[PDB]
Paper text:
[name] is a 60-kDa secreted neuronal protein, which consists of the N-terminal leucine-rich repeat (LRR) domain and the C-terminal epitempin-repeat ([name]) (also known as EAR) domain4. [name] serves as a receptor for [name] and is anchored to the excitatory postsynaptic density through PSD-95 scaffold. The [name]–[name] ligand–receptor interaction plays an essential role in AMPA-type glutamate receptor-mediated synaptic transmission via PSD-9533–35.
We crystallized the complex between [name] [name] and [name] ECD to elucidate the mechanism of the interaction between [name] and [name]. The disulfide bond between Cys260 in blade 1 and Cys286 in blade 2 stabilizes the whole β-propeller structure. Inside the central channel, Ca2+ is coordinated by the side chains of Asp334, Glu336, and Asp381, the main-chain O atom of Val382, and a water molecule bound to Glu383. The metalloprotease-like domain of [name] binds to the [name] domain of [name] with a buried surface area of 1034 Å2. The disulfide bond between Cys394 and Cys401 tethers the N- and C-terminal ends of the Trp398-containing loop to support its conformational change.
Author numbering:
A (entry chain B): 224 to 551
B (entry chain A): 233 to 625, 630 to 718
Write the structure that this text describes.
């Protein structure tokens, strides 16, 4: 196979997200410099992506969609003016601002992640400021409210939700991983009794990790550790801790996103200085190997979009044009 | 003037034991890493504040910590300045600590406001981070020392705002996307600080750096006779004078306030006028291209008439202290307000707090007690307000005060030490003491009861600055010369 170039959208982007609303596939694009949260819609007639709707916010970083019982909610992380929560109205056909995240608890957001634990919906906001604490919110039917703060006085860059097996258990339990500046990645474990994440442990061997993203092959659980300079790493989870698999040189990298397309496991390592490298999983090698080579200016994210047996690859650009790829 | 000049911060860096461990117990790595931090902070300062950050000294605690580093940056800052007082003997305009640890505060560092040129306040502390990040940390730490504080009164009012929506500004909360610019409001505060008589030690231009000589850096290093700046800005000044860091055929100098078309400015030419009544004017030596080192009157000289007394080139008055905390529109209360409220020793006026109970001020130590202002607001320019604002009422005088806490120990809202409380009397720990209690040094004088033989002014370097046609270290010798 190959990732062929579909189209190049004439604007910059930071974070790209996808979701399913009323059996249609949408794509949310966060525009840092303009302010818009750009929603894309699929045209089944012209086989292209239209412009569904926008959400205006002065310095958006993340636009995370949450779908609770067919109702669409969007978390808008802003560096200016504070973060807000929007709700899509089916009747008025618009987005409504229904909730405000206080500007003092969350000041410099950098990543938003969503997860579901025993029929409860949550989301976590990584705050890269010291005064701003990484906070978990909980869905209580009408809106989201503070549930737990983590990593005080830490410059948290990314959050990642994990479901991992702790030896000698046999069932996957919820986990969170926090990446902070000049610091080791932290693994939080979910405690059902207290209904909050505790028992934190550092990931040794990793200094200055920017972000963490996980994938699963053969039932085993892996993660991709990203550095800007130095070497990115791939690790396997084995009961109690993560183990070394391989490593790759990171030349100004901001992304190391694992993707699973058509039961094929891919891994796209972005680069600001050079060409973005796509990796494929090797069954014999139990390792990632060189696959295809992309060319995008300062990639910030890679997201997989599946529509009717058609697989698309969205690549965000911080200085250049955001690119859409076709997987054939 | 004083704000159009290029300022120079002679900085010393101290690397603690944890900073040394972060660089794998390597001396050469700690130095280059710290230099990188300083250089990037320099590029920030050079562009906006017209000030250079120059590394003049550095030491690294390779063996162990000299004292216990606290998670509280304010606690750490003080113990560091004590170490600085007793163990550091190299000269610098400011001494900053590079800690490999991380603070458990909202700030990535701490530094005394208006602290530069001082021995106890001339410093700050900075936590470890990425090179670009720590540079910002140093910039905002040195900003405090340099007098730059984000005016909360103007912030809340919307009078001062950061126009950068994405990266924000230096004195604001720092996140992943780092700031690059000071606000225009910050610039004004810095200028106000210099015009107030602050930053006197910032006008000596460093020559030999801690790095290999570089022609086109704007610094006269080893081997080179001069150094204009950059080929772009050398055109403005020094182009005709300096060629490839070498003086031309007909040139005594290249650039500077005392340099005119590659020639020295004659002795007696004013190169820097006094910013206030605490300052001493500087004249060109005639033998140097740079203006003479910025000096001022010693501590003890009066200012604002008899209402104030000079300290560190700055005038300490109750009126200015009120303006410093609550705003320029705010003025000090009448002496009658003090003469009644302070004596009571109530919450509405006192000479300090002793175990849940206020101290009732003595009748002489009334001007050294609870600070009283007029036309006060509800938000201080700096620090945190602890409690509520005191407001007390033929003329009826509105006495207002307030408790502002920078430190758990330091409380703004009481009369600052050194503030005049009468003829030849000042405040010391909420007590009115004579001038002899402060143990001021004195210049040489050959006439009894006069300073510098009644023909000169005693500088802060404890030297006599003689008047016109007077010479000698005691300014007693008369010298006639048109
Ligand atoms: C919470 O996480 C700990 C991991 O260790 C924790 O992290 C460090 C950063 C520190 O904070 C430590 O103080 C802290 O304990 C889990 O500890 C692990 O528990 C398991 C059993 O639950 C232990 O298994 C045993 O390990 C011995 C080792 O020789 C084996 O031979 C045995 O067969 C047995 O399986 C494991 O050793 C222990 N790990 C460590 C490093 O102590 C802890 O279980 C976890 N708590 C919960 C509720 O999940
Ligand atoms: C949503 O945002 C997009 C921005 O990508 C808008 O597209 C812009 O439309 C304006 C005209 O209104 C043009 O001037 C711009 O050049 C367009 N931008 C790009 C990148 O092509 C789109 O119109 C917005 N939609 C709504 C409903 O506001
Ligand atoms: Ca994340
Ligand atoms: Ca100096
Ligand atoms: Ca030079
Ligand atoms: Ca002077």
């Amino acid at each position: 196979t190959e990732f062929a170039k579909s189209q190049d959208l004439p604007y910059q982007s930071l974070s790209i997200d996808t979701f399913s609303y009323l059996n249609d596939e949408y794509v949310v694009i966060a525009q840092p410099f303009t302010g818009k949260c750009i929603f894309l819609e699929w045209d089944h007639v012209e086989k292209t992506f239209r412009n569904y709707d926008n959400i205006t916010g002065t310095s958006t970083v993340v636009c995370k969609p949450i779908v609770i019982e067919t109702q669409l909610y969007v978390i808008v992380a802003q560096l200016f003016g504070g973060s807000h929560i929007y709700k899509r109205d089916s009747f008025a056909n618009k987005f409504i601002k229904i909730q405000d995240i206080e500007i003092l608890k969350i000041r410099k957001p950098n990543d938003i992640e969503t997860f579901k634990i025993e029929n409860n919906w949550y989301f976590v906001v990584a705050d890269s400021s010291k005064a701003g604490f990484t906070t978990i919110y909980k869905w209580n039917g009408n809106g989201f409210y503070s549930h737990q703060s983590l990593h005080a006085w830490y410059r948290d860059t990314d959050v990642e939700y994990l479901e991992i097996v702790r030896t000698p258990q046999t069932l996957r339990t919820p986990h969170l991983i926090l990446s902070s500046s000049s610091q080791r990645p932290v693994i939080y474990q979910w405690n059902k009794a207290t209904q909050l994440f505790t028992n934190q442990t550092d990931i040794p061997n990793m200094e200055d990790v920017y972000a963490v993203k996980h994938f699963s092959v053969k039932g085993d659980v892996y993660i991709c550790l990203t550095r800007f300079i130095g070497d990115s790493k791939v690790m396997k989870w084995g009961g109690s801790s993560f183990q070394d698999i391989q490593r790759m040189p990171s030349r100004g990298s901001m992304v190391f996103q694992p993707l699973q397309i058509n039961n094929y496991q891919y891994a796209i390592l972005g680069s600001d200085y050079s060409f973005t490298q796509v990796y494929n999983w090797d069954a014999e090698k139990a390792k990632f190997v060189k696959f295809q080579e992309l060319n995008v200016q300062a990639p910030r994210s890679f997201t997989h979009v599946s529509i009717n047996k058609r697989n698309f690859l969205f690549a965000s650009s911080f200085k250049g044009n955001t690119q859409i790829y076709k997987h054939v | 003037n004083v704000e159009e000049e290029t300022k120079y911060i002679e900085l010393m860096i101290v690397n603690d034991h944890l900073m040394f461990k972060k660089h794998r117990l390597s001396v050469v790595h700690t130095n280059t890493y710290a230099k990188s931090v300083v250089n990037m902070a320099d590029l920030i300062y050079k562009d906006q504040l017209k000030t250079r950050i120059v590394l003049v000294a550095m030491e690294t605690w390779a063996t162990d910590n000299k004292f216990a580093i606290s998670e509280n940056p304010l606690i750490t800052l003080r113990e560091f300045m004590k170490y600085r007082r007793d163990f550091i003997k190299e000269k610098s305009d400011a001494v900053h600590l590079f800690s490999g640890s991380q603070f458990e505060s909202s700030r990535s560092g701490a530094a005394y406001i208006g602290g530069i040129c001082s021995l106890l306040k001339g410093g700050g502390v900075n936590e470890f981070g990425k090179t670009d990040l720590m540079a910002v940390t140093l910039a905002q730490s040195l900003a405090h020392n340099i007098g730059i504080i984000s005016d909360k009164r103007k912030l809340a009012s919307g009078e001062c705002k950061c126009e950068d929506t994405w990266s924000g500004c230096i004195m604001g909360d720092t996140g992943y996307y780092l700031p690059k610019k000071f606000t225009q409001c910050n610039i004004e505060e810095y200028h106000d600080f210099l015009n107030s008589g602050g930053g006197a030690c910032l006008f000596n231009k460093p020559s030999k750096l801690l790095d290999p000589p570089e022609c086109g850096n704007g610094f006269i290093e080893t081997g080179e006779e001069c150094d204009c700046g950059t080929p772009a800005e050398c055109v403005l000044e020094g182009a005709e004078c300096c060629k490839k860091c070498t003086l031309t055929q007909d040139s005594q100098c290249s650039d500077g306030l005392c340099c005119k078309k590659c020639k020295f400015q004659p002795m007696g030419t004013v190169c820097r006028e006094a910013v206030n009544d605490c300052d001493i004017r500087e004249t060109c030596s005639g033998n140097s291209s740079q203006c003479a080192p910025n000096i001022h009157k010693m501590d003890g000289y009066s200012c604002d008439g008899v209402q104030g007394i000079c300290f560190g080139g700055r005038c300490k008055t109750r009126d200015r202290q009120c303006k410093y905390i609550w705003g320029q529109k705010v003025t000090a209360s009448d002496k009658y307000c003090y003469e009644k409220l302070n004596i009571e020793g109530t919450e509405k006026g006192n000479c300090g707090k002793d175990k849940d109970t206020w101290i009732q001020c003595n009748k002489r130590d009334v001007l050294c007690g609870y600070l009283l202002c007029t036309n006060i607001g509800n938000i201080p320019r700096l620090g945190e307000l602890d409690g509520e604002i005191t407001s007390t009422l033929g003329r009826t005088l509105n006495c207002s005060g307030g408790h502002v806490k920078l430190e758990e120990d330091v409380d703004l809202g009481y009369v600052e030490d050194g503030t005049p409380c009468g003829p030849q009397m000042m405040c010391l720990e909420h007590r009115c003491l004579p001038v002899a209690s402060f143990n001021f040094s004195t210049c040489l004088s050959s006439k009894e009861g006069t300073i510098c033989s009644g023909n000169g002014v005693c500088s802060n370097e404890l030297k006599c600055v003689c008047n016109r046609h007077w010479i000698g270290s005691d300014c007693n010798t008369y010298f006639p010369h048109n």
